[PDB]
Amino acid sequence: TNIMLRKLITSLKKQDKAIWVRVAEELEAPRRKRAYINIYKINRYSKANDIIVVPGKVLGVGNLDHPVTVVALSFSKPAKEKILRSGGKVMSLYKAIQELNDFKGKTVRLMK
Amino acid sequence: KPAKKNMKSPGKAIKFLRFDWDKYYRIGRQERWRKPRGIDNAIRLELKGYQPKVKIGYRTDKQIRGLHPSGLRPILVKSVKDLEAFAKGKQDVIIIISSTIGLRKRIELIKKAEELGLKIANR
């Protein structure tokens, strides 16, 4: 219902890389079942400097082993602080389009 | 342009008045249409020759759907300011000067159109 939220959907489907399009229907899914992630899970299924895309929101429960950079559309202000002190990086979907490493990175997995 | 009239004249529209408007005056002056939600009613049963129940299939063609009868596009005006936002130009639309605008405002208002080459019906 956010004008931005709809607007990006217009652009996410535009990009051809198979990962982005999958985001839309997870996004277009009902709000009440919208994607969401708690931290403790991602730390348990990741390697060093992994890039993972979160189709939803990230919740701050759990501890982090190794700095990893994540890409999502929504964060918990506490959760981010857990991320930075762990040495990772945050990255919005909207800002993530302009990266050719985002185009041609390696070791990316998608969770929820 | 030549394909403007060649469906309305043969596809003669139907007044679509209320079911059983003819018998009782308490309907005729209502002069509109309703969907009969009955059981023993007729047109809901689609019996022959009873000004058949309205349905979506009798549309007008989308190329002219809602075109002005002169072929242009009908868009209204209410004051002097609305004129400047005329779309594209005088070539595809016609203007209906307000049904309620005053003449002491009309006299200047009307002059603004023909100087811009617009077409005015309610002159």
């Binding site: 219902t1 956010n2 004008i3 931005m4 | -």
Partner: protein
């Protein structure tokens, strides 16, 4: 990045505003707030609970026939029925009905920023159609503004940075609004006008401008959507002062 303006109309400083002003203009939440607080001021209306009920009316029973229908009549005349004359309403409104639309404090707060930021985009301010000759919007006045009492000098300031047009645009009070409200107090309708937010209240200018149509003075630590988005079309022209901004930046 915005310029700074004086009591005369010459640019003399330049700062980038606190990161609030860049926020997305999230229309939807604004209305869901602009409505929410507006619910508060609905003094609960309600029809009288005992309207028309002051009767002993009754049906004449059945088999009378002369009593055509089980309509209820009082010893000769019919009343009390929902469908007929004068009796109590079908479902009369009462003050017991809910009025307010509650919003969480946080939910209200984060929304409020949007309108504040809405005052930044020159696109949105004209989207509400406010007319203004200032090249830069919004506009910041050096904080000596707070020291004017005489009302007339206010005008030249709105003349200085060139805002007189929206002053006149409000001056086109749309005669008389249609409907009964003309006899229920709301006899007119007026286009909203420029908004001034000042750092502290009780300054001389707080009350000094309540004559110019469309304008209001409201303290920064107080102002919300009910002043920035009159009508849920946020982008209404606004004015601020340097000292006020710092009072904002603290969130």
């Amino acid at each position: 990045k915005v310029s700074v303006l004086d009591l005369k109309g010459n640019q003399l400083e330049e700062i980038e505003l606190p990161l609030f002003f860049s926020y997305p203009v999230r229309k939807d939440l604004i209305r869901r707030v602009f409505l929410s607080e507006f619910t508060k001021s609905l003094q609960p209306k309600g029809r009288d609970p005992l309207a028309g009920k002051r009767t002993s009316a009754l049906s004449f029973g059945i088999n009378l026939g002369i009593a055509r229908v089980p309509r209820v009549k009082g010893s000769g005349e019919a009343a009390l029925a929902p469908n007929t004359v004068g009796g109590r309403l079908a479902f009369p409104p009462t003050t017991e009905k809910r009025l307010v639309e509650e919003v969480n404090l946080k939910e209200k707060k984060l929304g409020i920023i949007s309108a504040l930021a809405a005052t930044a985009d020159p696109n949105f301010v004209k989207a509400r159609g406010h007319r203004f000759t200032s090249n830069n919007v919004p506009i910041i006045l050096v904080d000596d503004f707070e020291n004017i009492s005489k009302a007339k000098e206010i005008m030249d300031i709105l003349k200085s940075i060139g805002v007189v047009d929206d002053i006149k645009r409000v001056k086109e009070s749309k005669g008389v609004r249609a409907g009964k409200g003309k006899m229920r107090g709301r006899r007119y309708q007026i286009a909203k006008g420029p908004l001034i937010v000042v750092s502290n209240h009780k300054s001389p200018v707080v009350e000094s401008a309540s004559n110019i149509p469309g304008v209001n003075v409201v303290s920064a630590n107080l102002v919300s959507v009910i002043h920035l988005a009159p009508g849920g079309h946020p982008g209404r022209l606004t004015i601020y002062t340097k000292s006020s901004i710092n009072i904002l930046r603290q969130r």
